[PDB]
């Protein structure tokens, strides 16, 4: 073609912007988790990374599929490190995330972040 620069390349990345949706409305996250699914329902422990109604604000919105419901989880921004309840933050989301692989999130019992939201995987591993 005429035109170039188009085309995304995101491998291994820690927080594919994927994650990252431009959706302030949690209804619309729900309906989407189980949009982008081949099957019309989301993964249990389906996340991501939508936007607040604050200026420049981010909220963690995982899906319980315990529940069958979306859950919210603030990200604040403290000392350069988001956090979302408090004294315990994490530098970069990245890092947070993998704290939280081990760590169950706050306000439920066994609610941990295993498949990000848009992002796919392979049969292979399962």
Known sequence: GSSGSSGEDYEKVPLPNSVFVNTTESCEVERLFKA????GEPQ???YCIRNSSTK???VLVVWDETSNKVRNY???EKDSKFYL?????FVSVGSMVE???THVLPSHQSLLLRHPYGYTSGPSSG
Not at 36 to 39: D, E, L
Request: proline residues 5%.
């Open 85 to 89: 309840e408090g004294e315990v933050l």
């Open 99 to 101: 704290h939280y692989h």
């Open 36 to 39: 982008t699914s081949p099957r």
């Open 44 to 46: 249990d422990g389906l």
């Open 74 to 76: 603030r990200i604040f």
């Open 56 to 58: 420049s604000g981010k």
